[PDB]
Write an enzyme that holds these catalytic residues in place. Sequence first.
Site: not given
Lengths: 299, 298
Positions: B39, B141, B143
């Site tokens: 993503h 921040g 991920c």
Amino acid sequence: SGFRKMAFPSGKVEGCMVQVTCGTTTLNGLWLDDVVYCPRHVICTSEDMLNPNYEDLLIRKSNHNFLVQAGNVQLRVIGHSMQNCVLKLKVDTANPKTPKYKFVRIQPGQTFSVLACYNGSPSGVYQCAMRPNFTIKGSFLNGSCGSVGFNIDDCVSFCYMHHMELPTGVHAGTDLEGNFYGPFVDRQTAQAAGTDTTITVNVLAWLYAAVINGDRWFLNRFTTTLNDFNLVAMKYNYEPLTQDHVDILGPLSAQTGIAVLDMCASLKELLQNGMNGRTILGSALLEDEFTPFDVVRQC
Amino acid sequence: FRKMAFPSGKVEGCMVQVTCGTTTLNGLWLDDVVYCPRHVICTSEDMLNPNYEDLLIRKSNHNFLVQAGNVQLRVIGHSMQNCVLKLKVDTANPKTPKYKFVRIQPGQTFSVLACYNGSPSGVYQCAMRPNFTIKGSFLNGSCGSVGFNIDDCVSFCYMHHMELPTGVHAGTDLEGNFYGPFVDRQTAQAAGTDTTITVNVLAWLYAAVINGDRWFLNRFTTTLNDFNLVAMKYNYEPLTQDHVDILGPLSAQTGIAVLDMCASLKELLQNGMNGRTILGSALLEDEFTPFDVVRQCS
């Protein structure tokens, strides 16, 4: 919902742990620049530990009595000296992995990570606070002595070295200048830790973090004076609050609308009623190992 | 007895920062591949109904911004494996450890290295919940933060992808397969009813007996079938015959059979703890597996 208790990443400390052996005794050491620091009781047998004469024992040692091993690389001990309760072994090679570092002495209620080690091998890491009775609640089996505590800010601050396990299960140690935290001594005598109390200023920063995150169910309309609150807090074995604690909480009472002494009235009500099966930030108990500094600088 | 995380040094050296356009998250730099959530190729407006396989056709090697501290890495190829993007870079990571990708099962524990923009900031130990989420501390921040176990070999088993509204987090294995029924879209997603990991609770009570804390012990024994009747009433994962076999070494060290210890636990759920503590806790811990207890004790 959730504020887990995180430790600092341990990599910069891992490449500084070594093994130190003297006679049949082996423990952990800390290798910075060209000095290995370790507990001075490494030079003792179990016979010596009841009444150690540390000066008598160390004058009889030579540099070749100390075997220091960084993995498979043996280090040559080139001189030695005693500072308080820590031995400093000067070695012929400087540690190429030395981080930028500092020595700090901490006060009760401050938090730090511990790298628990066995025979110079790191095995696990956890976050803890220095209790008001100058002990730490940790998991140290035999052979973890010389394991260190640190904070990281690229700059590693070493604040603790493990020396001793106390009969109540808790642990005692020194700063890296070799001065014990608390009334403890490196002898096998009966040494009693004091009453462990809850760190009031830490519970209050955590409750302030609660109102910022969204929990407010525990608030009340009441306020209290510092003297009245401290009289109630004593009865639950909570540390008394001082004016210095009040000013440290001030930015948190600014981000929120709640005066400190107002928060103190709510804490007084939690102590008297309990939780009633509810939680604050996912926790079913009042948490006291999060300092104001950590909370202010994570909200 | 504390919840200890594995030392993080061998993983710290693999964390990098991946930027695609306006989105920045964490990546894992092993040999000459960077692994990260797919993503990262989506804008905040693309998360409604992303067509990843059409969005990846759009992008070229120069749309990906890969950073290992001060050093800058060059993407020479890209690829998707399920839900993980694989970016091929020009330089191998010289700090690559001996490693392995494993998928774990609910109830098992591992450490997480929480990161922000490729910089490691903390480490903690957690268990995969039976509803396939982890209760952790990730803010925006983090991920691409990874979970691992250390055996000289690092087994990577988790990579953070999403945060669910209840504060739980959800992720994949390093082959891009989700743990649990989640999808990598911005939409209403609910985690199932969480249950207490009963075999981990048993391991922890064995640990309390090892520490000499033996007051919940009683003279009684129960049966597997009778216990599970009480277990799922109180929302406790059913116990299996394999569960009894895993607890065997802790049953020999202590001398207390699993079904015996089950009668203790069954009495702790009905009658509460009578206002007493086990290992200093009024709370029954379920994030220590059996093998953690053997590791930390004997």
